[PDB]
Design a protein around this ligand. Structure first.
Ligand SMILES: [Ca+2]
Length: 279
């Protein structure tokens, strides 16, 4: 399949060179996989989700996304026009309030919730969790992410937006999950992206068009935008049978475009997510 005039980040993950505009992908499109978006919520009624999104848990008064961040991330995972895995199922867990903030105890509870809830869902091709959030180092938050991964869920987390070493941030610094940095459309490390030895992979993160609340769209930037590209790619590859939840991050790194990014500090991987699609 081919989507013409795609957002640049979708085109980039299906190409060996920057500057293309077509997203090439297998028709299966993540069907049979499930992605939990652990964030401010998801506007499940947005036409771009085609009925494939639902809220399953909130830690606040409502399950509605009053912010937009979670709806944007979910759209990059799995919306029709803006998504990597256009036929995946999306589950929303609202651990962040409508200002985009949340306490660590709530974020941990949402992680443990997903590890249990997946056992009640029909996800024959596997389960992914996308965490576009973080803060200062916490061993408890890292341990919760490690537990989720151990339980059989592919965990992708944002590296953070401080132009610093991600070792000082959580859950970015947990080695056993997939920590995602951000790049821009000219194959530079995004100027805000964290770096360091704990990063596993880069994905598109600057000027990313996706869904927004009120049935709208908008373009924003962050490692929060790179993470759902990698979460969606994992769901896509699991549906194709190329990898499993336990080994998807390593498979994505093994098959990435290598050495194409600029402004990568020594000791950080130079790897850009790539779907290896051949018609
Ligand atoms: Ca890792």
């Amino acid at each position: 399949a081919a989507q013409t005039n795609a957002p640049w980040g979708l085109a980039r993950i299906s190409s060996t060179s920057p500057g293309t505009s077509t997203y090439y992908y297998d028709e299966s499109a993540g069907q049979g996989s499930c992605v939990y978006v652990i964030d401010t919520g998801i506007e499940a009624s947005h036409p771009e989700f085609e009925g494939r999104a639902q809220m399953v848990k909130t830690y606040y008064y409502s399950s509605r996304d009053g912010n937009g961040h979670g709806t944007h991330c979910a759209g990059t995972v799995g919306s029709r026009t803006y998504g990597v895995a256009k036929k995946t199922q999306l589950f929303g867990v609202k651990v962040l309030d409508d200002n985009g903030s949340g306490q660590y105890s709530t974020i941990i509870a949402g992680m443990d919730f997903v590890a249990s809830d997946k056992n009640n869902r029909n996800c024959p091709k596997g389960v992914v969790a996308s965490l576009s959030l973080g803060g200062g180092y916490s061993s408890s938050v890292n341990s919760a992410a490690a537990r989720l991964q151990s339980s059989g869920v592919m965990v992708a987390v944002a590296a953070g937006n401080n132009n610093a070493d991600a070792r000082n941030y959580s859950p970015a610094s947990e080695p056993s999950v997939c920590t995602v940095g951000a790049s821009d459309r000219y194959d530079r490390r995004s100027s805000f992206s964290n770096y360091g030895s704990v990063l596993d992979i880069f994905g598109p993160g600057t000027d990313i068009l996706s869904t927004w609340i009120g049935g709208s769209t908008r373009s924003i930037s962050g490692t929060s935008m790179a993470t759902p590209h990698v979460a969606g790619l994992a769901a896509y590859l699991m549906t194709l049978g190329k990898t499993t939840a336990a080994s998807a991050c390593r498979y994505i790194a093994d098959t990435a475009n290598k050495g194409d990014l600029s402004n990568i500090p020594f000791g950080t991987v130079n790897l850009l997510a790539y779907n290896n699609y051949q018609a």
